[PDB]
Design a protein around this ligand. Structure first.
Ligand SMILES: *[C@@H]1O[C@H](CO)[C@@H](O[C@@H]2O[C@H](CO)[C@@H](O[C@@H]3O[C@H](CO[C@@H]4O[C@H](CO)[C@@H](O)[C@H](O)[C@@H]4O)[C@@H](O)[C@H](O[C@@H]4O[C@H](CO)[C@@H](O)[C@H](O)[C@@H]4O)[C@@H]3O)[C@H](O)[C@H]2NC(C)=O)[C@H](O)[C@H]1NC(C)=O
Ligand SMILES: *[C@@H]1O[C@H](CO)[C@@H](O[C@@H]2O[C@H](CO)[C@@H](O[C@@H]3O[C@H](CO[C@@H]4O[C@H](CO)[C@@H](O)[C@H](O)[C@@H]4O)[C@@H](O)[C@H](O)[C@@H]3O)[C@H](O)[C@H]2NC(C)=O)[C@H](O)[C@H]1NC(C)=O
Ligand SMILES: *[C@H]1O[C@H](CO)[C@@H](O[C@@H]2O[C@H](CO)[C@@H](O[C@@H]3O[C@H](CO[C@@H]4O[C@H](CO)[C@@H](O)[C@H](O)[C@@H]4O)[C@@H](O)[C@H](O)[C@@H]3O)[C@H](O)[C@H]2NC(C)=O)[C@H](O)[C@H]1NC(C)=O
Ligand SMILES: *[C@@H]1O[C@H](CO)[C@@H](O[C@@H]2O[C@H](CO)[C@@H](O[C@@H]3O[C@H](CO)[C@@H](O)[C@H](O)[C@@H]3O)[C@H](O)[C@H]2NC(C)=O)[C@H](O)[C@H]1NC(C)=O
Ligand SMILES: *[C@@H]1O[C@H](CO)[C@@H](O[C@@H]2O[C@H](CO)[C@@H](O)[C@H](O)[C@H]2NC(C)=O)[C@H](O)[C@H]1NC(C)=O
Ligand SMILES: *[C@@H]1O[C@H](CO)[C@@H](O[C@@H]2O[C@H](CO)[C@@H](O)[C@H](O)[C@H]2NC(C)=O)[C@H](O)[C@H]1NC(C)=O
Ligand SMILES: *[C@@H]1O[C@H](CO)[C@@H](O)[C@H](O)[C@H]1NC(C)=O
Ligand SMILES: *[C@@H]1O[C@H](CO)[C@@H](O)[C@H](O)[C@H]1NC(C)=O
Ligand SMILES: [Zn+2]
Length: 903
């Protein structure tokens, strides 16, 4: 499986002998099939490169490209500035390393430039890689758009190139396309699209030269899309593309309104202007990758770019602002200054995942979006990073070579832990000094490439220049958070005022085998409060220490990690927990809203880790009966979802629902009178989210008044279908519960609304809600639909199946389905997420019978692998073993607790 490593063309990393300067690329997509039923694109290119060290071979990336021979060879070599290229000996293609290899009869000379001409063609496949095709239905008409996805190593699939991020170059892009179609790229066209002289049916669009940039950020799109535009004061043209009908109705308007302000924010937050003449953002009906930050032409999944104020919810709105903010952040951080190699992906994706909140907050200052990062990124990644199977943020460059190894880095660790760690960094340094660090870093390395130590250097300079006191260097502090996996749990003893830290692990029976330089002790910044008042900062530099900041006497209490800015969990002594609970009972508002969620989330997590009694966590939810903020409720609901997954098929679920029924009812009554009987929605975003959770928790836990009103609204809709009386914020929870309470009539109505849907946001809500039927035959019939591309789009297959197994009645149904035709499923679905299916179907597993079924599932499907889901299967087995143990230990205690507190 390994080729001769002594040969440069058998090594995954490019050699350092040749460095490109300028490319010219002409592409011509054919949007109709040929004789072999293949969509093909024709291409021609020229790469001008500099010989940095004398070499007798040209090694360049090439993937699935078929070359037209010219002058006897795959390629033609020319000189520039009087250089004399050697004759070509022969060319070959090396598939594993994805190289075009041009062997020369002599050596290129050092410092001299050369040009290589190539003429080729490739498949315009339905594969979402390189230059590919995307198909959607515009009514009964089948539309085809040629578009691109280069990240991380697929630029080489559209034209031959030195396809590594630090091989920056300039690109002259020309698109040959049908007459009535718009061509788009990174830069603006040099002029109006002109007819191809050989065939007026085609047009030629030549784009201006790009600045120095990485191949993975290139973009070519040919479509019949329309646009809304808006020109900013500083000259930057802002355009937004989508299907003509979607833009005609104004669904691109909101994205347009926020793009300007977001670009303005980043211009100031970075202290460098927007480096491009324009900003294109395009919404594609099909785009599994979510969004790609191509420089000047950012591609989005349609349902994340388009917005309809008459049917899209606030979450839909929040989705748009935050995603746009993320990708636009890359237009400086990532595109202007690019990573040296893929092992530093966490710095790029982590930074954008963090500042997406800052940008979006600028566009919508009334929302307080920044507060949501703790739930969305911090606690999300903490579930995965608290496992023995996690990995450090940073990876040695030499360990990331193959395309598969690169793809594995695009995970929750890189994004969410990357964001969390950087937010913590911007916290213990002043944000102002963090900004100052950013500014110099950007200016210094513009149009170039960096490793993460470069950013550390510039931040360190800002620290010295601003005279910010730290326990040690920025480098040494951050090493604790990048070189080793996981995060600490800080246990506080408020009697002695001593702090203690250790590697936090969700599984009490975990087996960490990955060694660490520091042996899992961190240098950690501690912000804290006492009786609502914030104290002086502290630095924990050892396993254990003492300070009077964490000592208490009498009725006073303390709390660590203000607003959860630090990437760690906190535990307290029994005495301190009691005072905090008493504070929550007396006046919970005295504790920051984020920290109220912390108290709950940490407690439930520490409970699973055998660090607090499970009854403690449950006690930390008692105050929720008078809690009206969204965040603390959401945190408890998220943690109790595990309890639901463990107990919703047992005797425990009864008292559990009765408890949640007791806690949420006053909140439900409140919103009922607050919104004046659901006539209005709150003006504050959090309150809007809070109301939705209240209604959602009320109905699923059996409060009568909620059940009556959701089915009442839905029947009212069934009578006025073209006049949906249900506010968008409430649609998912109302559709679902009404479908659950009703039967065939409701389901068929919802199904027809889904089939006729012209708004993707609405169709997504219907798809999920349809899985809420309590009729087994209906769910069974729905299951058969999920594999039919005419009924359910393949990109929505897994999620629709997943939504079905979320239903208790669908659990055994889907699990039987997975066991029955896995062999047919692994063959006849590509990009079907077996990983998510395996995880979703095994979440409920808590018995020895389920484990043995899963153990047999693995054995029965040995010779036919599990592919991308192979890893999820091993984690499901370990999780199942953990669940069996947890259930047998907490079943009695939890049943008793829910019973006592349901009265
Ligand atoms: C991708 O696209 C870029 C941008 O268009 C191309 O770069 C251009 O390439 C042109 C063709 O070689 C260049 O034209 C030449 O410019 C020479 C002057 O060079 C200076 O360039 C700097 C900027 O780098 C300016 O500040 C100076 O003011 C000058 O413009 C001329 O001397 C040269 O002379 C011509 O030679 C031709 C040869 O046939 C004669 O026919 C003609 O009569 C005339 O004597 C010529 O005009 C151009 O400078 C250059 N533009 C820039 C800004 O770099 C890349 O070549 C493209 N890449 C690929 C691989 O195709
Ligand atoms: C650049 O060159 C590469 C390498 O040659 C091309 O890749 C090749 O693509 C073809 C599809 O056109 C693959 O062919 C196979 O097709 C069968 C199914 O179709 C079959 O058609 C033949 C007649 O040609 C019949 O005799 C058979 O009964 C059958 O109907 C399918 O079973 C295979 O899975 C495969 O798709 C071929 O495998 C593939 N070659 C390699 C080695 O990758 C590529 O198309 C070309 N690019 C362009 C732009 O044409
Ligand atoms: C969170 O921590 C625990 C969670 O359970 C709570 O402790 C509970 O506090 C109440 C306070 O009223 C205790 O009630 C007491 O119970 C005794 C009798 O003991 C009982 O005996 C029967 C058998 O006869 C057992 O089945 C019970 O388990 C219990 O041992 C009775 O005289 C009074 O009702 C007395 O108040 C309750 O026992 C206790 N739960 C436990 C430990 O089982 C705690 O309050 C809560 N903290 C909060 C509210 O924030
Ligand atoms: C995208 O941004 C545009 C531009 O701001 C928004 O359009 C504008 O929306 C406002 C608020 O509804 C409208 O204000 C109105 O002004 C009139 C006076 O002209 C006043 O009588 C009304 O009471 C109201 O306040 C304004 O007409 C409108 N401007 C344009 C260009 O039509 C739009 O709302 C934004 N779109 C989205 C979905 O965010
Ligand atoms: C492709 O080229 C043709 C010919 O230049 C363009 O057709 C012109 O389009 C403009 C704007 O719509 C019309 O006002 C002219 O009458 C057309 N010129 C003719 C008839 O020769 C066409 O616009 C180009 N396609 C694109 C991408 O717009
Ligand atoms: C902790 O986070 C809270 C938000 O959960 C912050 O409270 C906001 O602070 C900003 C400062 O500009 C005010 O404009 C907002 O009105 C506050 N929101 C609310 C609803 O209180 C708070 O600043 C943070 N505390 C610290 C010091 O870290
Ligand atoms: C940086 O700090 C130094 C003093 O430490 C001083 O020159 C001035 O305050 C700042 N200006 C720069 C960038 O030198
Ligand atoms: C969907 O739209 C078509 C075209 O108007 C119509 O015939 C059909 O009844 C619609 N389906 C329903 C029942 O919503
Ligand atoms: Zn990103």
């Amino acid at each position: 499986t390994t080729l001769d490593q002594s040969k440069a063309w058998n090594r995954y990393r490019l050699p350092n002998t040749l460095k490109p300067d300028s490319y010219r690329v002409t592409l011509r997509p054919y949007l109709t099939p040929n004789d072999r039923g293949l969509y093909v694109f024709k291409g021609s290119s020229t790469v001008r490169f500099t010989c940095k060290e004398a070499t007798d071979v040209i090694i360049i990336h090439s993937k699935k490209l078929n070359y037209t021979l010219s002058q006897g060879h795959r390629v033609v070599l020319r000189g520039v500035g009087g250089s004399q290229p050697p004759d070509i000996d022969k060319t070959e293609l090396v598939e594993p390393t994805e190289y075009l290899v041009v062997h020369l009869k002599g050596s290129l000379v050092k410092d001299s430039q050369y040009e290589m001409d190539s003429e080729f063609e490739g498949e315009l496949a339905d594969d979402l890689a390189g230059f590919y095709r995307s198909e959607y239905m515009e009514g009964n008409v089948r539309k085809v758009v040629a578009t691109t996805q280069m990240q991380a190593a697929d630029a080489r699939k559209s034209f031959p190139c030195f396809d590594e991020p630090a091989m920056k170059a300039e690109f002259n892009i020309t698109l040959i396309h049908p007459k009535d179609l718009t061509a788009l790229s990174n830069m603006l066209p040099k002029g109006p699209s002109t007819p191809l002289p050989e065939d007026p049916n085609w047009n030629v669009t030549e784009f201006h030269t790009t600045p120095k940039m990485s191949t993975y950020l290139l973009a070519f799109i040919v479509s019949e899309f329309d646009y809304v535009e808006k020109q900013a004061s500083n000259g930057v043209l802002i355009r937004i593309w989508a299907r003509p009908s979607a833009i005609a109705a104004g669904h691109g308007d909101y994205a347009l309104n926020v793009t300007g302000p977001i670009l303005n924010f980043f211009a100031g937050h970075y202290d460098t202007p927007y480096p491009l003449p324009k900003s294109d953002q395009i919404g594609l009906p099909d785009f599994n990758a979510g969004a790609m930050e191509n420089w000047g032409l950012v591609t989005y999944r349609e349902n994340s770019l388009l917005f309809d104020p008459l049917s899209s919810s606030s979450s839909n709105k929040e989705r748009v602002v935050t995603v746009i903010a993320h990708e636009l952040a890359h237009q400086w951080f990532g595109n202007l200054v690019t990573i040296e190699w893929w092992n530093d992906l966490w710095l790029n994706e982590g930074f954008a995942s963090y500042v997406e909140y800052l940008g979006a907050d600028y566009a919508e200052p009334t929302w307080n979006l920044k507060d949501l990062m703790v739930l969305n990124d911090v606690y999300r990644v903490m579930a995965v990073d608290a496992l023995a199977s996690s990995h450090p943020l940073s990876t040695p460059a030499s360990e990331i070579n193959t395309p598969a190894q690169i793809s594995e880095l695009f995970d929750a660790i890189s994004y969410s832990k990357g964001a969390s760690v950087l937010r913590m960094l911007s916290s213990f340094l002043s944000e102002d000094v963090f900004k100052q660090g950013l500014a110099s870093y950007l200016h210094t390395f513009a149009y170039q490439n960096t490793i993460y130590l470069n950013l550390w250097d510039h931040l360190q300079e800002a620290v010295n220049n601003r005279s910010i006191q730290l326990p040690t260097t920025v480098r040494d502090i951050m090493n604790r958070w990048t070189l080793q996996m996981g995060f600490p749990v800080i246990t506080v003893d408020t009697s002695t005022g001593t702090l203690s830290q250790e590697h936090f692990l969700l599984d009490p029976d975990s087996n960490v085998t990955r060694p660490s330089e520091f042996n899992y002790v961190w240098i950690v910044p501690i912000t804290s409060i006492r009786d609502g008042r914030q104290q002086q900062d502290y630095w924990l530099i050892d396993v254990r220490a003492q300070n009077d900041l964490f000592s208490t006497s009498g009725n006073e209490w303390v709390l660590l990690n203000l607003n959860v800015t630090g990437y760690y969990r906190v535990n307290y002594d029994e005495e301190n927990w009691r005072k905090i609970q008493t504070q929550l009972q007396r006046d919970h508002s005295a504790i920051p809203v984020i920290n109220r969620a912390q108290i709950i989330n940490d407690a439930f997590n520490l409970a699973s880790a055998h660090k607090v009694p499970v009854t403690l966590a449950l006690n930390n939810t008692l105050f929720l009966i008078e809690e009206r903020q969204y965040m603390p409720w959401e945190a408890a609901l998220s943690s109790l979802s595990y309890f639901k997954l463990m107990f919703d098929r047992s005797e425990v679920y009864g008292p559990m629902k009765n408890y949640l029924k007791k806690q949420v009812t006053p909140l439900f009554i409140h919103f009922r009178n607050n919104t004046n009987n659901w006539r209005e929605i709150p003006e504050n975003l959090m309150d809007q989210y809070s109301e939705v959770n209240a209604i959602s928790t009320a109905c699923s836990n059996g409060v009568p008044e909620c059940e009556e009103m959701v089915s009442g609204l839905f029947k009212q809709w069934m009578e006025n279908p073209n006049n949906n009386p249900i506010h968008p914020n409430l649609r998912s929870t109302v559709y679902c519960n009404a479908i659950a309470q009703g039967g065939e009539e409701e389901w068929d109505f919802a199904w027809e609304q889904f089939r006729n849907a012209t708004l993707v946001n609405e169709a997504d809500k219907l798809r999920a809600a349809l899985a809420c039927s309590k009729e087994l035959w209906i769910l069974n019939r729905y299951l058969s639909y999920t594999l039919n591309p005419d009924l359910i789009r393949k990109q929505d297959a897994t999620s629709t199946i997943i939504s079905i197994t979320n239903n208790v009645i669908g659990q055994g149904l889907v699990w039987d389905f997975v066991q029955s035709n896995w062999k047919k499923l692994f063959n006849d679905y590509g990009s079907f997420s077996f990983s998510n299916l395996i995880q979703a179907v095994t979440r409920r597993f808590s018995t020895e019978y389920e484990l043995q079924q899963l153990e047999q599932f693995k054995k029965d499907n040995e010779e036919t692998g599990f592919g991308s889901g192979t890893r999820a299967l091993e984690q499901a087995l370990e999780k199942t073993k953990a669940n069996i143990k947890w259930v047998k230990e907490n079943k009695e205690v939890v049943l008793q607790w829910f019973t006592e507190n349901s009265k």
